[PDB]
Design a protein around this ligand. Structure first.
Ligand code: B9K
Length: 325
């Protein structure tokens, strides 16, 4: 037989025999991930199992989305699919999907923990922005970018793992407050990651939505009252009739002591970094920098040179065909 089974975490991966020595390298909600040796191609791969894609609408829609976009999207800063398979032989038996992609060497959480280096941070942020730009050009606004869905090779090449849409640490104010969004929603998430590379602390932790919002305004200040008028009626009473917070300036939010010091080079880079932070970490999306302007920012520019609803049966059929195709 062409398949074999191996126990992975709490579950069972059933894979083609080309894929050998499966070891877990991570998990997300969407499914669990193994490194493996692909003996046919003679290289290492990452293998993700989708168990309950067609269990319910939510799971099926996202599985179908992930599968179709991973096949249709080709960009250096988006993870590439190498193979797709199911061990089941017919539609009736069909249960699981396995996605095989290129293996990276670390998550962004690990790189965030390393000492601050301008050329690395600049490069990582350029690549993230390149990836985001390309998704937006294809009509995909991510809305869920976070360190745990970004991976990197040891040479600092960066790859976004997924196409997006609790712990809402990286989500933009407009999304948390449910107030409609545009492309620059993803810029907030980049700003949260950039600040975290500098501070080595999650910028905006929170027990829940309320405290999450509190922590943003604590730091950035309560926004201009024009912003609140766009809030659904009760969200608005909360925000509007809370206490006015004067936040902190960007030099106070990210002091000189966090950055390389005592050369003009490092002095320039520190203020470019803080300048970029101050344009991304902006509560009101109408004042937040765009993807294109961020690519042109002097800290970054050194690197230039459907939704329709289905039944369960139908989602299963659509997914199956996408796999078999
Ligand atoms: C939701 S998490 C996730 N999903 C996928 C599809 C991946 C993925 C995709 C491609 N490559 C990797 N390479 C990779 C990432 C990290 C590590 N580390 C090894 C030590 O322990 C901490 C992580 C090892 C290898 C991971 N990650």
């Amino acid at each position: 037989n062409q398949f074999y089974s191996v126990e992975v975490g709490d579950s069972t991966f059933t894979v083609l025999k080309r894929y050998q020595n499966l070891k877990p390298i991570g998990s997300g909600a969407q499914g669990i991930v193994c490194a493996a040796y692909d003996a046919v191609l003679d290289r290492n791969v990452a293998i993700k199992k989708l168990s309950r894609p067609f269990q319910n609408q939510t799971h099926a829609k996202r599985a179908y989305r992930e599968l179709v976009l991973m096949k249709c999207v080709n960009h250096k800063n988006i993870i590439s699919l190498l193979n797709v398979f199911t061990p089941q032989k017919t539609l009736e038996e069909f249960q699981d999907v396995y996605l095989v992609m290129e293996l990276m060497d670390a998550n962004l959480c690990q790189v965030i923990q390393m000492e601050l280096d301008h050329e690395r941070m600049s490069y990582l942020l350029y690549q993230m922005l390149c990836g985001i730009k390309h998704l937006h050009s294809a009509g995909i606004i991510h809305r869920d970018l976070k360190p745990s869905n970004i991976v990197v090779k040891s040479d600092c090449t960066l790859k976004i793992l997924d196409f997006g849409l609790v712990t809402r640490y990286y989500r933009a104010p407009e999304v948390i407050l449910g107030m409609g969004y545009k492309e620059n929603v993803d810029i907030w998430s980049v700003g949260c990651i950039m600040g975290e590379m500098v501070r080595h602390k999650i910028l905006f932790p929170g027990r829940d939505y309320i405290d999450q919002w509190n922590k943003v305004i604590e730091q950035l200040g309560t926004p201009c009252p024009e912003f609140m008028k766009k809030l659904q009626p009760t969200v608005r009473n909360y925000v509007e009739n809370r206490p006015k917070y004067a936040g902190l300036t960007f030099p106070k939010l990210f002091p000189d002591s966090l950055f390389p010091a005592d050369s003009e080079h490092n002095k320039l880079k520190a203020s470019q970094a803080r300048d970029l932070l101050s344009k991304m970490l902006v509560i009101d999306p109408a004042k937040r920098i765009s993807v294109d302007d961020a690519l042109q920012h002097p800290y970054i520019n050194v690197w230039y040179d459907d939704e329709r609803e289905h039944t369960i049966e139908e989602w299963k059929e659509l997914i199956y065909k996408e796999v078999m195709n």
